[PDB]
């Protein structure tokens, strides 16, 4: 089951023609379809007969009954109004070391002036998503160091324990079956040293 962008992240200023402004990303339907409140927020903000672009489908103004009509990627971009969401959630959870071991890095994703990210996977099952940006983030200064290693573990088939803080939840990935948080540190697995 996928992870659902909390209402709050709804950009009041929608992207124009599928160009979600920087740091924001096109809301998918699987997501809007899942976020009850957002839907509900919509019924009351959507003026009569307006059509809205999404990554997947289109959302028709309540005059049309207000609908999440499916559609192909970036099809709804033909329309001005595009549903975007900011990728950063200030969780409120306390800053602390959480880590998962024996994972690998995969699925590099990169916005424009936002985080570089990756999906750490253990034995096929995706485990967690981590991100690192030199522009925003409680750790924006650790980017340059981390990015360099993120990269090495990426070309090499190297397994690692990854430390992550949950004080920031990242939604750059559309329709995920895993959570994304801020990358705090990587550590090549070393069994003998008792790391993995």
């Amino acid at each position: 089951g996928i992870v659902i962008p909390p209402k709050a992240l709804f950009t009041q200023q929608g992207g124009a023609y599928g160009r979600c402004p920087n740091g924001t990303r096109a809301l998918t339907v699987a997501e809007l379809r899942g976020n009850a409140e957002l839907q509900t927020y919509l019924r009351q903000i959507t003026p009569g007969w307006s059509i809205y672009g999404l990554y997947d489908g289109t959302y028709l103004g309540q005059a049309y009954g207000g609908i999440i009509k499916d559609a192909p990627p970036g099809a709804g971009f033909i329309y001005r109004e595009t549903f975007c969401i900011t990728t950063i959630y200030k969780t409120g959870q306390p800053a602390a070391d959480h880590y998962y071991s024996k994972v690998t890095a995969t699925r590099l994703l990169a916005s424009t002036n936002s985080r570089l990210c990756a999906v750490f996977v253990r034995d096929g099952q995706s485990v967690i998503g981590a991100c690192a940006s030199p522009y925003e983030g409680r750790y924006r200064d650790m980017y340059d160091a981390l990015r360099r290693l993120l990269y090495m573990i990426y070309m090499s088939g190297l397994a690692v324990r990854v430390h992550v803080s949950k004080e920031e939840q990242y939604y750059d990935y559309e329709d995920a079956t895993f959570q994304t948080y801020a990358l705090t540190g990587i550590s090549l697995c070393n069994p003998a040293a008792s790391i993995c």
């Binding site: 360099r148 990269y151 090495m152 070309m155 090499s156 088939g157 190297l158």
Partner: protein, 224 residues
């Protein structure tokens, strides 16, 4: 559990393969040298190993990319734009030893300074299995032909099967192949670029039917 079946991408066709199998370039049965490309290096090829991979997926992507290379060639005006690849299904008996185990073992027998890190990182990423000496027709139980017309975007799959294929229940040998310490001065792990592929595996696939750019994995494992 050890694998039972491995794959091997090759540019040689079934009438050839089904009847003669594959045979290693040479007698150097040194794990590290092969694992690091040294024994498959252009004009230094002598590994007593036939590369295979327990991951079809792996093979599929190499081919999937080799094919694209064609298109991009014709695009520049080098190629005819067509491609023909083969992916052979092989019965991995106890004469196929894992590259992983074998590497990690040669290391915990000679010393961490005796083996280069990436070269083992690489052996894991290829799920390479070392068919020691030769891999006979009897084990090749199938093949998948891949024709592509990059001009018209047509990909054609077709599976022929070996008659000579002998069926028996086997699995790759669990005990790693053990080599003596290398003597060679290895510089780094030679590996073919985009996508990364083992100089043996990537190089044994080519035959007579230009020079392959082999690069040192380490020279770029860390960005410049």
């Amino acid at each position: 559990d050890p694998p039972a079946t491995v794959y091997r991408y090759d540019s040689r066709p079934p009438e050839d393969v089904f009847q003669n199998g594959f045979t290693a370039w040479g007698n150097n049965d040194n794990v590290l040298e092969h694992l690091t490309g040294r024994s498959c290096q252009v004009g230094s090829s002598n590994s007593a190993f036939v590369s295979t991979s327990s991951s079809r997926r792996y093979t599929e992507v190499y081919l999937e990319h080799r094919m694209q290379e064609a298109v991009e060639a014709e695009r520049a005006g080098r190629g005819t734009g067509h491609f023909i690849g083969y992916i052979y299904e092989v019965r991995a008996d106890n004469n196929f030893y894992g590259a992983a185990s074998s590497y990690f073992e040669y290391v915990d027998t000679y010393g961490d300074n005796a083996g280069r890190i990436l070269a083992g990182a690489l052996a894991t990423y290829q799920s390479e299995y070392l068919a020691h000496r030769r891999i006979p027709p009897e084990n090749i139980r199938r093949v998948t032909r891949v024709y592509h017309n990059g001009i018209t975007g047509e990909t054609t799959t077709t599976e022929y099967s070996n008659a000579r294929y002998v069926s028996q229940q086997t699995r790759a040998n669990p005990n790693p192949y053990t080599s003596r310490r290398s003597v060679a001065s290895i510089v780094g792990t030679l590996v073919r670029m985009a996508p990364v592929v083992g100089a043996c595996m990537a190089r044994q696939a080519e035959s007579s039917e230009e020079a392959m750019v082999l690069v040192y994995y380490e020279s770029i494992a860390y960005s410049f």
